[PDB]
Amino acid sequence: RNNPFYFPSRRFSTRYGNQNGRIRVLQRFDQRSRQFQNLQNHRIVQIEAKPNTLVLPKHADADNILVIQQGQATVTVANGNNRKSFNLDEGHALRIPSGFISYILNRHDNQNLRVAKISMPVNTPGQFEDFFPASSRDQSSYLQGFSRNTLEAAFNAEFNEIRRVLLEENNEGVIVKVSKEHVEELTKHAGDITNPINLREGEPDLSNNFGKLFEVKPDKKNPQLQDLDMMLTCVEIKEGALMLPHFNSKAMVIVVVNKGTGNLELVAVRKEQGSNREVRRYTARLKEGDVFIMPAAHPVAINASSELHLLGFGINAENNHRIFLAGDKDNVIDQIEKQAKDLAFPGSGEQVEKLIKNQKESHFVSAR
Amino acid sequence: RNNPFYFPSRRFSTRYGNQNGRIRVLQRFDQRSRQFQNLQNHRIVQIEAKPNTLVLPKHADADNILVIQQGQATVTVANGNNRKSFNLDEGHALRIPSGFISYILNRHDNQNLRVAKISMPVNTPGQFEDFFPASSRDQSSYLQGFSRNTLEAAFNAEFNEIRRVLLEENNEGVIVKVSKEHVEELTKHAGDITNPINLREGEPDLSNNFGKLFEVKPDKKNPQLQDLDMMLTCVEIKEGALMLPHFNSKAMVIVVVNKGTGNLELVAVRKEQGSNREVRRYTARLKEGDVFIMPAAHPVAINASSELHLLGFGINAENNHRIFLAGDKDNVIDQIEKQAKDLAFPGSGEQVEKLIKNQKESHFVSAR
Amino acid sequence: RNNPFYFPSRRFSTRYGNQNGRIRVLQRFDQRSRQFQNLQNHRIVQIEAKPNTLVLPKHADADNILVIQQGQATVTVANGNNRKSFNLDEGHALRIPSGFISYILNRHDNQNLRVAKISMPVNTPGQFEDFFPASSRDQSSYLQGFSRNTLEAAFNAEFNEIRRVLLEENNEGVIVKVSKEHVEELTKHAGDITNPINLREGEPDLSNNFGKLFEVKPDKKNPQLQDLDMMLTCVEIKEGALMLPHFNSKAMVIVVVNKGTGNLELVAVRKEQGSNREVRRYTARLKEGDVFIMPAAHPVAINASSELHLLGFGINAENNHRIFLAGDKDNVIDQIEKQAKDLAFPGSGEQVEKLIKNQKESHFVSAR
Ligand SMILES: [Cl-]
Ligand SMILES: [Cl-]
Ligand SMILES: [Cl-]
């Protein structure tokens, strides 16, 4: 309602759902508002699959970066001439190019998996589909749409054998249950096939007693990220803590909440509908799985009720600067010239400058 | 009708047409469907001019790559400070930048020329116009839209002389007939003026008894192509042969048929209009001059009735992978893990894997 | 009216206006016509502030390049960890990234400042807003849209003190008057903070007795410009002089008139609304502050009534070529093959070629 920047579950539709897991696909941002039209090629998926199961083979006509949000997983990318599976624990990023086959298995015996992917449609600005080689309960094989003669010619065989072996609809859809022994071989064995990145790998950018913010960037370091102009981020906010009023200089963040709960403040600037320019606040209640859009140069503050884990997909990331409006470091206001503050602000300069030296910590403080 | 991916002649309008040749311009893809909205800046032209004739001088506000589809030709690019004509035989690519003057002459005495260009509009997303310095039967000179004073001032002369020499409407339009002797001097003499590429130059990517596929890529090799993110391709399919079910990982191909005829299978994935996802086939009859769009990650199979020559302009080409769904090499299904196939497909793993080792050739086989 | 390419003052709305200056923002080009849809992310601002005043602190969610059009100025960019002010005299370009704080002061005692900026919206294709940390008569502080608790928590203080010092609405809006002494310290002290470029720095590209054209390009030289694919230009046309019929091979120029007045000829190519292709002229009267769009491959001629200063922001600038249709140098017509002219033009080749050697100067001549 009030908030076009906040998307919870009811905005999440369900493409596929059985007792072994489910796959949610978030609606095209360019509907609710043109406030972020420039995000329209970025569609969000969230996946959840029970222990010892598997998301079946397919590919999309959409670029993809994939990230382990809860639990444990063994993912496989596949090529025309190459396969290459990896095991990914949480806060691990993997990139599945377009047209490349891939499947995900929940390595874990007792605990779950809750994978979150961004998708990037190639053909149609807002749209991507899946292509399954295998038919099943919930979808159809893309080889069924071929001819009797071609299939036979292609595969060197009669229609009956191809059909009986490959085409027939068997499984209860796109996520099926797996043996324990079968798993030991899929794991056993764990190009444009990039290696999996760890989003927490180095020393975190922002860090103190109340919070942490890891961030991988479009760099000479990571060649892939540089190619997409896209940064990946992870924020962790302690219970009772406050991520202070801040913003991103230029990146447009699609944030999605891993776990926990907390308190969103987003502040926009609104032409109605010498025209009055309005500072309208927007707030929202954050819960496991929620999503909030965080446009460029727009201030936000976030307070954690619970131990709060956030994931952040950044667009237009190159040379981004997360600027802060309070604290010792990354304080942008502090940097303003002293006569600059004196004239702008109601108070004197030295007084206004004194209130800035008042808050002596940096990025995260105690909420209250 | 049924097929939005298939464009034949009736989709081709005619911008210019006389007894010495004609120029066809294919309608904006973003009309029929938003299924390939992202192709809207790519407009197709096809040109046909008799022996010993010439397409007259002009430029467009549209980038351009040009390719000899049938016959023989001598093409001239021109600059503010430089001219540079080349002779191009078939399967030769030439790039005419934006704002650069150019004309084409049919070098050949008895045989024709059937040039195919892609155009890339600079100003308006879907639209480009021609600018002719000379007036004629079918169009007007862009200097006529200047003033009496300016022209005179610019050119150092009275209006009468400028008009009599340059402006007056003379020719039967934009393609005129040429002398034999005149030709010997235009040929005699055969910057941002790039040299002409040969699309068949090296050793072909795919090759056997039934087919060939040459392809030039956006590479450290070809600097221009790298700049456009655009690959050029040529496929040759023998009579009776089958280009197996395949697709492009990420590139969006605008294919155009040089010569011959054959059998198009295109397989899409269709949301109508937990929603049913439909494998809808699309087919089409291919004839000299036809065009079919070949979106990313979408399977196609093509069988040649006649000796079939195809041209392919690729978009989003960088690190493309043409993936194949049948054959020894570039077989993507083969690469799937063995337990992966067993669970997905109706058959067992070893059985499903046996049907793959059945077809022992690679990319092209005998259709029937 | 008649001209969609010509935008004068009445097209310029007023975002902010007091006795100490004013800020004009030109309407989104994608309204009047889709003739330049591809310019829709480029919005024009023009600023005018009296001697000894200041445009107050803010940032936008829009990239920005800024240029001194008349007078003298001291500009400050600011960061989360860095400030860096420069003094800029006319024809000086400065780049203010997105999310970065900045303010402008009129250094001069008796003379004015008339700054012209291009803005580039990050979030919404055509739209950018300002974000002021300080509240005032004409706008509101973006910290007012925060909460009682957060502000207090963030800043380490009660609501009263924060409000009294920082939040309260004090000034007569966004441009205020400054002391003489205050100025001596702001000037006294005169990252992603780029140094200021001089657009007249080297030896001018085009130059003679009647005109000058300076131009900075997207180069290995200027790294920033290369990043934006954007060239900056300055043209100076003598009273009575003529900038000859010319055009840009590929760049789309947003031109804005610094000072003087003169005579615009723009020549388009018009499908109505084997279709008739029309050379329609467009003209316009140019006055201090006017703006005219100059699409790619489109001819223009400009004659100066008065000493005429033009500013030019180029889009799609990489490897642009300004091509000329008259004069010794950059004459594109001259470059056409001799048999090429003979057939195209009404006259013979040698005659048509003689009228080209007639005008012996290059780029600027005497209008009449
Ligand atoms: Cl963030
Ligand atoms: Cl192809
Ligand atoms: Cl210009």
PDB file of C-alpha atoms in Angstrom, chain C residues 218-364:
ATOM      1  CA  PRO C 218      35.987  10.921 -24.695  1.00  0.00           C
ATOM      2  CA  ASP C 219      39.624  10.004 -24.706  1.00  0.00           C
ATOM      3  CA  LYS C 220      42.526   8.078 -23.201  1.00  0.00           C
ATOM      4  CA  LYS C 221      43.359  11.682 -22.209  1.00  0.00           C
ATOM      5  CA  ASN C 222      40.190  12.577 -20.264  1.00  0.00           C
ATOM      6  CA  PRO C 223      39.203   9.403 -18.417  1.00  0.00           C
ATOM      7  CA  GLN C 224      35.864  10.747 -17.109  1.00  0.00           C
ATOM      8  CA  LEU C 225      34.579  11.799 -20.564  1.00  0.00           C
ATOM      9  CA  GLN C 226      35.471   8.365 -21.984  1.00  0.00           C
ATOM     10  CA  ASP C 227      33.304   6.897 -19.206  1.00  0.00           C
ATOM     11  CA  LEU C 228      30.216   8.926 -20.225  1.00  0.00           C
ATOM     12  CA  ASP C 229      30.711   8.587 -23.999  1.00  0.00           C
ATOM     13  CA  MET C 230      30.258  12.384 -23.941  1.00  0.00           C
ATOM     14  CA  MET C 231      32.141  15.242 -25.592  1.00  0.00           C
ATOM     15  CA  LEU C 232      32.057  18.892 -24.555  1.00  0.00           C
ATOM     16  CA  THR C 233      32.391  21.666 -27.122  1.00  0.00           C
ATOM     17  CA  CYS C 234      32.566  25.443 -27.394  1.00  0.00           C
ATOM     18  CA  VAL C 235      31.916  27.442 -30.573  1.00  0.00           C
ATOM     19  CA  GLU C 236      32.527  31.176 -31.070  1.00  0.00           C
ATOM     20  CA  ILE C 237      31.060  32.846 -34.150  1.00  0.00           C
ATOM     21  CA  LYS C 238      32.105  36.381 -35.155  1.00  0.00           C
ATOM     22  CA  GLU C 239      29.531  39.047 -35.937  1.00  0.00           C
ATOM     23  CA  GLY C 240      28.572  38.757 -39.621  1.00  0.00           C
ATOM     24  CA  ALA C 241      30.165  35.283 -39.881  1.00  0.00           C
ATOM     25  CA  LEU C 242      28.745  31.933 -41.097  1.00  0.00           C
ATOM     26  CA  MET C 243      29.384  28.505 -39.627  1.00  0.00           C
ATOM     27  CA  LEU C 244      28.868  26.619 -42.898  1.00  0.00           C
ATOM     28  CA  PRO C 245      26.384  23.782 -43.509  1.00  0.00           C
ATOM     29  CA  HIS C 246      27.738  20.894 -41.447  1.00  0.00           C
ATOM     30  CA  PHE C 247      26.837  18.013 -39.205  1.00  0.00           C
ATOM     31  CA  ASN C 248      28.049  15.450 -36.743  1.00  0.00           C
ATOM     32  CA  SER C 249      28.677  11.963 -38.060  1.00  0.00           C
ATOM     33  CA  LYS C 250      27.320  10.277 -34.911  1.00  0.00           C
ATOM     34  CA  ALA C 251      27.049  12.516 -31.820  1.00  0.00           C
ATOM     35  CA  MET C 252      23.687  14.012 -30.724  1.00  0.00           C
ATOM     36  CA  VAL C 253      24.305  17.548 -29.542  1.00  0.00           C
ATOM     37  CA  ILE C 254      22.401  19.462 -26.906  1.00  0.00           C
ATOM     38  CA  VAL C 255      23.558  23.001 -27.750  1.00  0.00           C
ATOM     39  CA  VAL C 256      22.885  25.976 -25.442  1.00  0.00           C
ATOM     40  CA  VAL C 257      23.647  29.624 -26.258  1.00  0.00           C
ATOM     41  CA  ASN C 258      25.966  31.388 -23.764  1.00  0.00           C
ATOM     42  CA  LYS C 259      25.702  34.880 -25.251  1.00  0.00           C
ATOM     43  CA  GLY C 260      25.004  36.822 -28.464  1.00  0.00           C
ATOM     44  CA  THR C 261      22.390  36.147 -31.176  1.00  0.00           C
ATOM     45  CA  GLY C 262      22.224  34.458 -34.614  1.00  0.00           C
ATOM     46  CA  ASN C 263      20.528  32.504 -37.392  1.00  0.00           C
ATOM     47  CA  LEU C 264      19.698  28.752 -37.135  1.00  0.00           C
ATOM     48  CA  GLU C 265      19.197  26.508 -40.169  1.00  0.00           C
ATOM     49  CA  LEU C 266      18.357  22.882 -39.377  1.00  0.00           C
ATOM     50  CA  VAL C 267      17.492  20.368 -42.134  1.00  0.00           C
ATOM     51  CA  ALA C 268      15.623  17.152 -41.390  1.00  0.00           C
ATOM     52  CA  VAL C 269      14.283  14.207 -43.399  1.00  0.00           C
ATOM     53  CA  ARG C 270      10.586  13.544 -42.888  1.00  0.00           C
ATOM     54  CA  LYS C 271       8.370  10.541 -43.506  1.00  0.00           C
ATOM     55  CA  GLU C 272       4.846  12.010 -43.552  1.00  0.00           C
ATOM     56  CA  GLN C 273       3.286  12.299 -40.044  1.00  0.00           C
ATOM     57  CA  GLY C 274       6.843   3.885 -51.615  1.00  0.00           C
ATOM     58  CA  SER C 275       6.355   6.746 -49.158  1.00  0.00           C
ATOM     59  CA  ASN C 276       7.512  10.277 -50.078  1.00  0.00           C
ATOM     60  CA  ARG C 277      10.693  11.300 -48.192  1.00  0.00           C
ATOM     61  CA  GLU C 278      10.722  15.074 -47.532  1.00  0.00           C
ATOM     62  CA  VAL C 279      13.603  17.495 -46.994  1.00  0.00           C
ATOM     63  CA  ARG C 280      11.913  19.824 -44.516  1.00  0.00           C
ATOM     64  CA  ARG C 281      13.883  22.886 -43.350  1.00  0.00           C
ATOM     65  CA  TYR C 282      13.551  24.148 -39.777  1.00  0.00           C
ATOM     66  CA  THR C 283      14.820  27.610 -38.683  1.00  0.00           C
ATOM     67  CA  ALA C 284      14.938  29.579 -35.447  1.00  0.00           C
ATOM     68  CA  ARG C 285      16.021  32.867 -33.825  1.00  0.00           C
ATOM     69  CA  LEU C 286      18.815  32.398 -31.282  1.00  0.00           C
ATOM     70  CA  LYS C 287      19.130  34.526 -28.094  1.00  0.00           C
ATOM     71  CA  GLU C 288      21.164  34.350 -24.882  1.00  0.00           C
ATOM     72  CA  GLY C 289      20.084  31.185 -23.059  1.00  0.00           C
ATOM     73  CA  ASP C 290      18.330  29.400 -25.904  1.00  0.00           C
ATOM     74  CA  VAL C 291      18.757  25.704 -26.602  1.00  0.00           C
ATOM     75  CA  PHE C 292      18.656  23.738 -29.869  1.00  0.00           C
ATOM     76  CA  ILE C 293      18.919  19.982 -30.440  1.00  0.00           C
ATOM     77  CA  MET C 294      21.188  18.874 -33.209  1.00  0.00           C
ATOM     78  CA  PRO C 295      20.583  15.231 -34.058  1.00  0.00           C
ATOM     79  CA  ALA C 296      23.175  12.962 -35.752  1.00  0.00           C
ATOM     80  CA  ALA C 297      23.837  13.080 -39.524  1.00  0.00           C
ATOM     81  CA  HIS C 298      21.481  16.118 -39.798  1.00  0.00           C
ATOM     82  CA  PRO C 299      22.814  19.214 -41.542  1.00  0.00           C
ATOM     83  CA  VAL C 300      22.944  22.615 -39.836  1.00  0.00           C
ATOM     84  CA  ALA C 301      24.181  26.095 -40.736  1.00  0.00           C
ATOM     85  CA  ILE C 302      24.477  28.889 -38.138  1.00  0.00           C
ATOM     86  CA  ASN C 303      25.120  32.582 -38.834  1.00  0.00           C
ATOM     87  CA  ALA C 304      26.032  35.078 -36.083  1.00  0.00           C
ATOM     88  CA  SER C 305      24.244  38.441 -35.986  1.00  0.00           C
ATOM     89  CA  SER C 306      26.177  39.297 -32.817  1.00  0.00           C
ATOM     90  CA  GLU C 307      29.337  37.868 -31.189  1.00  0.00           C
ATOM     91  CA  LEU C 308      27.875  34.390 -30.674  1.00  0.00           C
ATOM     92  CA  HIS C 309      28.924  31.927 -28.010  1.00  0.00           C
ATOM     93  CA  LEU C 310      27.601  28.412 -28.046  1.00  0.00           C
ATOM     94  CA  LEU C 311      27.975  25.500 -25.666  1.00  0.00           C
ATOM     95  CA  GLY C 312      27.564  21.921 -26.858  1.00  0.00           C
ATOM     96  CA  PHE C 313      26.979  18.784 -24.840  1.00  0.00           C
ATOM     97  CA  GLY C 314      27.505  15.727 -27.070  1.00  0.00           C
ATOM     98  CA  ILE C 315      25.980  12.255 -26.582  1.00  0.00           C
ATOM     99  CA  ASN C 316      27.284   9.118 -28.337  1.00  0.00           C
ATOM    100  CA  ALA C 317      30.522  11.111 -28.804  1.00  0.00           C
ATOM    101  CA  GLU C 318      33.201   8.361 -29.229  1.00  0.00           C
ATOM    102  CA  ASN C 319      34.805   8.627 -32.687  1.00  0.00           C
ATOM    103  CA  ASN C 320      32.402  11.388 -33.740  1.00  0.00           C
ATOM    104  CA  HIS C 321      33.189  13.207 -36.981  1.00  0.00           C
ATOM    105  CA  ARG C 322      31.910  16.695 -37.652  1.00  0.00           C
ATOM    106  CA  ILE C 323      31.476  16.539 -41.423  1.00  0.00           C
ATOM    107  CA  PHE C 324      31.233  19.656 -43.587  1.00  0.00           C
ATOM    108  CA  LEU C 325      29.318  20.091 -46.812  1.00  0.00           C
ATOM    109  CA  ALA C 326      31.214  23.169 -48.050  1.00  0.00           C
ATOM    110  CA  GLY C 327      34.815  24.474 -47.936  1.00  0.00           C
ATOM    111  CA  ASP C 328      38.307  23.178 -48.683  1.00  0.00           C
ATOM    112  CA  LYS C 329      38.742  21.111 -45.453  1.00  0.00           C
ATOM    113  CA  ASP C 330      36.279  18.648 -43.895  1.00  0.00           C
ATOM    114  CA  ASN C 331      34.499  18.843 -47.203  1.00  0.00           C
ATOM    115  CA  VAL C 332      32.792  15.491 -47.522  1.00  0.00           C
ATOM    116  CA  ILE C 333      31.450  16.183 -51.061  1.00  0.00           C
ATOM    117  CA  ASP C 334      34.961  16.842 -52.403  1.00  0.00           C
ATOM    118  CA  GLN C 335      35.865  13.258 -51.264  1.00  0.00           C
ATOM    119  CA  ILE C 336      33.196  11.591 -53.433  1.00  0.00           C
ATOM    120  CA  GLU C 337      34.750   9.860 -56.518  1.00  0.00           C
ATOM    121  CA  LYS C 338      34.694  12.055 -59.669  1.00  0.00           C
ATOM    122  CA  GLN C 339      32.450   9.641 -61.664  1.00  0.00           C
ATOM    123  CA  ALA C 340      30.334   9.379 -58.534  1.00  0.00           C
ATOM    124  CA  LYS C 341      29.458  13.121 -58.663  1.00  0.00           C
ATOM    125  CA  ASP C 342      28.927  13.159 -62.465  1.00  0.00           C
ATOM    126  CA  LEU C 343      26.110  10.571 -62.316  1.00  0.00           C
ATOM    127  CA  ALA C 344      24.475  11.710 -59.071  1.00  0.00           C
ATOM    128  CA  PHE C 345      24.475  15.481 -59.692  1.00  0.00           C
ATOM    129  CA  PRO C 346      22.720  17.273 -62.621  1.00  0.00           C
ATOM    130  CA  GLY C 347      26.003  18.724 -63.873  1.00  0.00           C
ATOM    131  CA  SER C 348      29.058  17.011 -65.276  1.00  0.00           C
ATOM    132  CA  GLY C 349      31.762  15.862 -62.901  1.00  0.00           C
ATOM    133  CA  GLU C 350      34.459  18.421 -63.733  1.00  0.00           C
ATOM    134  CA  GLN C 351      31.890  21.279 -63.517  1.00  0.00           C
ATOM    135  CA  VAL C 352      30.454  20.079 -60.173  1.00  0.00           C
ATOM    136  CA  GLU C 353      34.029  19.551 -58.992  1.00  0.00           C
ATOM    137  CA  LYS C 354      34.903  23.115 -60.124  1.00  0.00           C
ATOM    138  CA  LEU C 355      32.181  24.693 -57.947  1.00  0.00           C
ATOM    139  CA  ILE C 356      33.790  22.924 -54.946  1.00  0.00           C
ATOM    140  CA  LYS C 357      37.248  24.435 -55.619  1.00  0.00           C
ATOM    141  CA  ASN C 358      35.408  27.756 -55.911  1.00  0.00           C
ATOM    142  CA  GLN C 359      34.925  28.156 -52.141  1.00  0.00           C
ATOM    143  CA  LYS C 360      38.563  28.126 -51.012  1.00  0.00           C
ATOM    144  CA  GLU C 361      38.238  28.704 -47.225  1.00  0.00           C
ATOM    145  CA  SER C 362      37.195  25.912 -44.799  1.00  0.00           C
ATOM    146  CA  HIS C 363      34.757  26.046 -41.871  1.00  0.00           C
ATOM    147  CA  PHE C 364      33.685  29.627 -41.256  1.00  0.00           C
TER     148      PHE C 364
END
